[PDB]
Design brief:
Its main location: nucleus. It comes from Homo sapiens (Human). The chain has 265 residues and is mainly alpha-helical. It has twelve helices and four strands. The protein is 64% helix and 5% strand. The chain binds the ligand Cc1nnc(-c2ccc(OCCCOc3ccc(CCC(=O)O)c(F)c3)c(F)c2)s1. The site of ligand Y5I has 19 residues, from helix 4, helix 5 and strand 3.
Length: 265
């Protein structure tokens, strides 16, 4: 904030953080407080096997077991899409873009955002579910029958490496906006207005990380590099769905996810 240009970058960071808080009900700071046993929040019920999953169904409240779980992740993605869409609308310039490009930017951005923010709810042993009321172990997720036995592993591998960056919600707010305003999504009609916005967002992210993580060298670059991992998670998940739909012909797909995945990659 030391000159007027950089003060406007601060104002943009604060705007996005504010909108993020308003849009996403379970923040990283709340997730971390649940996972680490802090006294601001309530310990989760832990599901690590079939009997504890049965108990959990009664305690949390919220068909083979693998399919119920897989579909539960899809319902969560649909809620996430709703929240990401409302956040996207708050990004200055987004709603003024061509409507076709608004739709394309959401279509290709929402999963990258979902896996970014999924890391906030993960550690190397498992993941928060039902808004933090439950915690499902990574080993229980690995135990599910084929073809569902490894669908969570790439997301855990990503999370453990992403979490070592030690980003907070104020950082994440800007990073998620940068993800959405990507000028290289396929089929965009007007790239230039997108990149002008993305430029501003990147400038704000960069100053946010230098202020908030003054001791953490090239954090900005190391964060942008993680956009590689996110892309690979997505393309791998799409391949897995192609497999699942051949053996599991009785599995339905929420219409929002169907539209998103159509001709995605
Ligand atoms: C009985 C039960 N019924 N539901 C249960 C349940 C268990 C675990 C859940 O979440 C674990 C973390 C979310 O992980 C993700 C999220 C999104 C995707 C991508 C999905 C797509 O968009 O295609 C993903 F692949 C994994 C959960 F929400 C519900 S237990």
């Amino acid at each position: 904030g030391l000159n007027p240009e950089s003060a406007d970058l601060r104002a943009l960071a604060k705007h996005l953080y504010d909108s993020y808080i308003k849009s996403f009900p379970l923040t990283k700071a709340k997730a971390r407080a649940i996972l680490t046993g802090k006294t601001t929040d309530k310990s989760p019920f832990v599901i690590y096997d079939m009997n504890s999953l049965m108990m959990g169904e009664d305690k949390i409240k919220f068909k083979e077991v693998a399919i119920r779980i897989f579909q539960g992740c899809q319902f969560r993605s649909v809620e996430a899409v709703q929240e990401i869409t409302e956040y996207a609308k708050s990004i200055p310039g987004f709603v003024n873009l061509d409507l076709n490009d608004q739709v394309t930017l959401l279509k290709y951005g929402v999963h990258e955002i979902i896996y970014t923010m999924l890391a906030s709810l993960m550690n190397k042993d498992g993941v928060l579910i039902s808004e933090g009321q439950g915690f499902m172990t990574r080993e229980f997720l690995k135990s599910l029958r084929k073809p569902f036995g490894d669908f969570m592993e790439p997301k855990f591998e990503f999370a453990v490496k992403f979490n070592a960056l030690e980003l907070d919600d104020s950082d994440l707010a800007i990073f998620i906006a940068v993800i959405i305003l990507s000028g290289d999504r396929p089929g965009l009609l007007n790239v230039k207005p997108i990149e002008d916005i993305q430029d501003n967002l990147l400038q704000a992210l960069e100053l946010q990380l230098k202020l908030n993580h003054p001791e953490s060298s090239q954090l900005f670059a190391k964060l942008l590099q993680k956009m590689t991992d996110l892309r690979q998670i997505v393309t791998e998940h799409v391949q897995l769905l192609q497999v699942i739909k051949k053996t599991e012909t009785d599995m339905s797909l929420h219409p929002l996810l169907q539209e998103i995945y159509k001709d995605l990659y």
